Amino acid sequence: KADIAIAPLTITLVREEVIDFSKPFMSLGISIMIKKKPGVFSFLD
């Protein structure tokens, strides 16, 4: 249905067995995402 993928596609062993990838144009890694000044009279804290 197409001929090329200029996309944020991730390389992996399985997809290479069936299609040909190029040299990576950016490197990355899995990571984890989580939910995230003293007052004027702060000397009383």
Binding site: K1, A2, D3, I4, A5, I6, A7, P8
Partner: peptide, 29 residues
Amino acid sequence: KTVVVTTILESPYVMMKKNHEMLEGNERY
């Protein structure tokens, strides 16, 4: 010669333009 290019809307890699309603073809991306 022309290439069939596949993509997905995963910002900031691919995202539609503001008011892309007036854009047609490759310009809407």
